[PDB]
From TrEMBL:
This is Putative phycobilin:C-phycoerythrin II lyase. It comes from the Bacteria. One of its GO terms (molecular function) is lyase activity. One of its GO terms (cellular component) is phycobilisome. The keyword Lyase applies. InterPro entries: ARM-like, ARM-type_fold, PBS_lyase_HEAT. Keywords: Antenna complex, Lyase, Phycobilisome. SUPFAM superfamilies: ARM repeat. The lineage of its organism: Bacteria, Bacillati, Cyanobacteriota, Cyanophyceae, Synechococcales. Belongs to the CpcE/RpcE/PecE family.
Length: 404
């Protein structure tokens, strides 16, 4: 319910799906013949949330849909995301033919789907997946990361010289593989400056790759990279809790804590990202498309003397509280600085059940500790056990054990 505190309007897209018996019926038909032809996409999405063997073998047929059509290739794409969600090895033959295809969006879906299934691939399978590797760089990067996560060392001869590909998106991936799969943790030093590259795609890539690499001594580098906390948290938990056991070793517990508290004034920010300490400049940066800029806006908002802050915070909030981006930096600034006057936002954000605003529950949980909001314990105790996302489940646990 954050549209109610909102001059800005966040519009959801609610589409009415199908049942399972109706989905199976329409997913293979010719869309020329269907009452509501849009039903052909929602049937793959719906059968991916199913569990029956009959529905899985219908998804395999939608994954083998004749691409001479335009309407059947889209449905083939969603059956392939669907077979990745189903995580059954029965899909593997379907997905490997998609590798051989022209529509390269179903190739990139099919690889990621094979990654999700995490089944044991054969020597022949590794070779077909290597054919996909010689596409173009956005596809190469998905093929390398598939070997990196599947943990497939036969292809070491192919990924190895990519480490010197000119595109950091391909090369970073190939160095991740060399660390994770071939156990040379040395290729990663390139990524540490790339965590503050002027080009946001490499900055995000570097966060992505350093977690795929499994070199936990890179954890401190993630703490301060101007990239979305969610990405940094996800990669940091791939290093400290590789098995998603919801337990961080207490040797790292403070380095994870400050990654998750995401203090904009202690992140590594270039001069161009830091805006002036003025009402309209804080507001552009928070509205910017790039997180590096946004951290600079939240950086200077904190820097503003408290009196004007208390109003700037308020006006910005009544303007954009439904913007999940602005909703996060507001919650964080209140909690990081301990602004007791805006204790209401720390409680609002922690109660936020709409999944988009999750990072804000993290900022709110750290704010309850900083502010001593012990009345929130029945809600922290709830998340400590049933919060779906690990960095959130773990944050509430840390706050509970030291909330007095």
């Amino acid at each position: 319910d954050p549209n109610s505190s909102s001059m800005a309007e966040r519009f959801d897209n609610l589409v009415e799906g199908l049942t399972e018996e109706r989905a199976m019926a329409v997913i293979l038909a010719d869309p020329d013949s269907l009452e509501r032809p849009v039903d052909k996409y929602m049937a793959a999405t719906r059968l991916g949330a199913s569990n029956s063997e009959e529905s899985l073998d219908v998804l395999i047929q939608a994954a083998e849909l004749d691409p001479e059509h335009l309407f059947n290739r889209i449905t083939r794409r969603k059956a392939i995301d669907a077979l990745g969600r189903r995580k059954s090895p029965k899909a593997l033959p379907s997905l490997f033919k998609a590798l051989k295809c022209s529509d390269e969006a179903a190739v990139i879906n099919s690889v990621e789907a094979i990654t999700k299934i995490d089944a044991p691939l054969t020597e022949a399978d590794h070779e077909k997946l290597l054919e996909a590797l010689k596409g173009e760089d956005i596809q190469k990067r998905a093929v390398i990361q598939a070997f990196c996560r599947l943990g497939v060392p036969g292809v070491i001869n192919s990924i190895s010289p990519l480490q010197d590909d000119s595109n950091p998106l391909v090369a970073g991936a190939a160095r991740a593989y060399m660390s994770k799969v071939a156990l040379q943790p040395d290729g990663l030093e390139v990524l540490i400056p790339q965590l503050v590259d002027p080009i946001a795609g490499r900055r995000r890539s570097a966060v992505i790759d350093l977690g795929d690499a499994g070199d936990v001594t890179r954890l401190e580098a993630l703490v301060t990279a101007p990239v979305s906390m969610s990405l940094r948290a996800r990669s940091a938990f791939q290093l400290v809790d590789p098995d998603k056991t919801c337990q961080v070793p207490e040797k790292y517990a403070e380095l994870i804590t400050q990654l998750l508290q995401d203090n904009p004034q202690q992140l590594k920010l270039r001069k161009e990202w830091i805006c002036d300490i003025e009402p309209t400049e804080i507001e552009n940066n928070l509205q910017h498309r790039d997180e590096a800029r946004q951290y600079g806006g939240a950086s200077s908002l904190m820097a503003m003397p408290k009196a004007e802050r208390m109003i700037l915070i308020n006006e910005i909030k009544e303007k954009l509280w439904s913007d999940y981006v602005t909703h996060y930096y507001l919650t964080a600034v209140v909690g990081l600085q301990g602004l007791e006057e805006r204790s209401d936002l720390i409680r609002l954000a922690l109660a936020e059940t709409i999944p988009q605003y999750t990072k804000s529950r993290i900022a709110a949980a750290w704010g309850c500790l900083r502010l001593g909001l012990v009345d929130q314990k029945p809600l922290l105790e709830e998340l400590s056990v049933s919060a779906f996302w690990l960095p959130l489940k773990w944050t509430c646990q840390r706050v509970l054990k030291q909330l007095s």
